From a paper:
One of these energy-consuming enzymes is the conserved huge AAA+-type ATPase Rea1 (also known as Mdn1), which is composed of a hexameric AAA+-ATPase domain, followed by a long tail consisting of an α-helical linker region, a flexible aspartate/glutamate (D/E)-rich domain and a C-terminal metal-ion-dependent adhesion site (MIDAS) homologous to the inserted (I) domain within the α-subunits (αI) of integrins that mediate ligand recognition. The conserved interaction between the C-terminal Rea1-MIDAS and the Rsa4-UBL (ubiquitin-like domain) or Ytm1-UBL is essential for assembly of the 60S pre-ribosome in a reaction mediated by the Rea1 ATPase upon ATP hydrolysis that leads to the removal of Ytm1 and Rsa4 from distinct pre-60S intermediates. In this study, we report crystal structures of the Chaetomium thermophilum (Ct) Rea1-MIDAS, both alone and in complex with its pre-ribosomal substrates, the CtYtm1- or CtRsa4-UBL domains. Besides displaying the typical MIDAS fold known for integrins, the CtRea1-MIDAS crystal structures reveal evolutionary conserved Rea1 specific structural elements.
Next, we aimed to structurally investigate the complex between CtRea1-MIDAS and its two ligands, the ubiquitin-like domains (UBL) of CtRsa4 and CtYtm1. However, purification and crystallization proved to be challenging and might have been impeded by the conserved but flexible MIDAS loop (element II). Since this loop (deletion of amino acids 4734–4773 in CtRea1, or 4657–4696 in ScRea1) is dispensable for MIDAS–Rsa4 interaction, we replaced it with a short Gly-Ser-Gly linker. Using these trimmed constructs, we were able to reconstitute the complexes CtRea1-MIDAS∆loop–CtRsa4-UBL and CtRea1-MIDAS∆loop–CtYtm1-UBL, which readily crystallized, allowing us to solve their crystal structures at 1.89 and 1.84 Å, respectively. Although the overall structures of the Rea1-MIDAS ∆loop domain in complex with either Rsa4-UBL or Ytm1-UBL are highly similar to the MIDAS apo structure, the terminal helices α1 and α9 were slightly tilted (as observed upon binding of integrins to its ligands for the C-terminal helix). The Mg2+-binding site in this case is fully ordered and the metal ion is coordinated cooperatively by the MIDAS and UBL domains. However, one unforeseen major structural re-arrangement concerns the Rea1-specific element III, which in the apo structure forms a loop that crawls along helices α1 and α9 and was not fully resolved, but in the ligand-bound form becomes re-arranged, the short helix α8 partially unfolds and forms a β-hairpin that provides an additional binding site for the UBL domains of Rsa4 and Ytm1. To investigate the importance of this binding site for interaction with the ligand Rsa4, we mutated two residues (CtRea1 F4951 > A/R; CtRea1 I4959 > A/R), which lie within the β-hairpin and directly contact the Rsa4- or Ytm1-UBL.
Numbering used by the authors:
A (entry chain B): 28 to 128
B (entry chain A): 4696 to 4737, 4777 to 4886, 4892 to 4997
Write the structure that this text describes.
Amino acid sequence: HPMATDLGSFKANFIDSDGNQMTDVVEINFADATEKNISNLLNTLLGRDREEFTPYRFRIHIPGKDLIIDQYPNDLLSLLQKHGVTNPFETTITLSAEPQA
Amino acid sequence: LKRPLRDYGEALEMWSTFQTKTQALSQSLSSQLRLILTGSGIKRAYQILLCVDDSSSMSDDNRSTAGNLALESLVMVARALTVLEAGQIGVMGFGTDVFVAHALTDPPFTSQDAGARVLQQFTFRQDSTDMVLLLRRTIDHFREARLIQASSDLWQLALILSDGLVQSRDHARLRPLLREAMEQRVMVVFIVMDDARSRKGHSVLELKEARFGPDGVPVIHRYLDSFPFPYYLIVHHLEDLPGALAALLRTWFAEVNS
Ligand SMILES: [Mg+2]
C-alpha cells in the first residue's frame, strides 16, 4: 500500500513436529502476521472447515543461525531484523506448527 | 568497495562447460530467431540487454539453484544471439544494485575470455531483488542509447533471467515502469527460472498468497495471479528455453506485424 510505510511481506514454510512440510510455501504480509492470523491461515491451507480449525502456536526458525524462537513476538518484522535477517522475503522463514488442542 | 568476483579459473571452466552443454540448444534458438528477426527488418539492428538476477534467492537449493539455470541460460542465449550478427548484446546484473557486466559496445561473445569475465561477476548473494530499480536503469540505459544513436531506429529488447520472486506489493509498483518501457517501444520479456528439481511446495507455480479480509478470514491466491509482466515464459529444464523463447517472440512479431 503507501510507499512511505508499507511493511512488505515474507514467505512461510510450515513444518510439523516431525519436521515434515505441511503446505505449499505461502506469502504473508507483515501487517497480518499475528500468531492467530497465521494459525487460521494454516488451517485454511489444509482445507479444514471453519469449525474444524486446530489452534496452532508457532516456533520461528532464524535463517543463518541454528536458533529457534519459541515465544511469538509482538512484531515479527522487528524480531527477524534484530537477528540479522534484513530482508525476510529474500529467504523463506520456517515455522514449526504446534497443535494446541 | 568492489563486488566479490569468482576465481577466473572457475569462471572459465563454467563458460566452457556451459557452452558445451548448450551448443545444440543455442543452434536451434539461433535458427529460429534468424527467421523471426531476419525478417521484419534486418535495415534494422537490435540492442539486447540480458538482465541477470544476482540476488541470494537464486542460491536457495530448495529451488535447485535458479542461479545455475540462469547462468546456463545466459550462455545459451548470448551465444545464440552472437552468431546472428544483427546488433549489440549487453549484460546487466541486479539485486540491491544494478550493474553493467558487459556493455553494448564491449567485445562480442566469440571469445571464452569475454564470457568468463561476465560469469565472474555473478555470485547470487545480494540481500534484495530490486526489480523497480532494474526497470528504471534499463529504460534509462536504452534511452541514452537512442539519444547517442540520433546524434551520430534500433529495436531494443530486455530479457530478464530471474526466479521472478519479489514481494507481491511490488507487482503494482512495476506496472507504471512497464508502461513507460512500452511507450518508448522497449520490449521486455521475463524468463522465469523454475527448476523442475525444486522441492515439492517450493515451485513458483506452487507459491500461495494470503489475503485477510475485514473479517479476518484468509483468502488464498496464487503468486503469479498478479505477475505484472505481460510477456514471460517459465523454464523448468535448460532444454525448455529455445522452443519457448522463440515461440513467444514469433507470436509477438506475428501480432505486431498484424
Ligand atoms: Mg531474489
